[PDB]
Amino acid sequence: CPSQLTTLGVDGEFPEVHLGQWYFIAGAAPTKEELATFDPVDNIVFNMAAGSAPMQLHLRATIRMKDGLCVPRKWIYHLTEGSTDLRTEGRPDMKTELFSSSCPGGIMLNETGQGYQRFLLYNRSPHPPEKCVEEFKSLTSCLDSKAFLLTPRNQEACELSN
């Protein structure tokens, strides 16, 4: 260990490049309780799009549960003025920071809320090379987030409109 943690900033375009679909690959956190929300998940496809009011972004997803069910979700994020952090509507305690990852099609989030933090790994590919997952696990372990979750991604993605 020692960060090679590299921030992606939107205070400085980031939006246009990151539009479209992303897959949830893995999470890491100080303990398992703060990842357990993902235990029933087989896979998740997300779609990010521009918002319709200043500083807003639309995030949509469909979650494939391990029991085969498809569950639509949506959130509205807000870019904090003069900051690299994002807020999420309806969750006043929550903050998200974005980081580059070792793999080309990847992106890493750190989420914090009341009492917890977690790192979350996404990729443009639903099945990125195993090296991407390993590098994520190593980076986060060194940052003291040693509890780990890998999404199994054994089922098909659910439908999510463009």
Ligand SMILES: CCCCCCCCCCCCC/C=C/[C@@H](O)[C@@H](N)COP(=O)(O)O
């Ligand atoms: C707006 C993000 C800016 C980055 C845009 C490009 C990258 C997008 C990658 C996908 C990010 C998905 C983040 C969502 C995570 C949720 O699963 C958790 N917050 C749980 O939410 P819960 O189910 O508890 O509500």
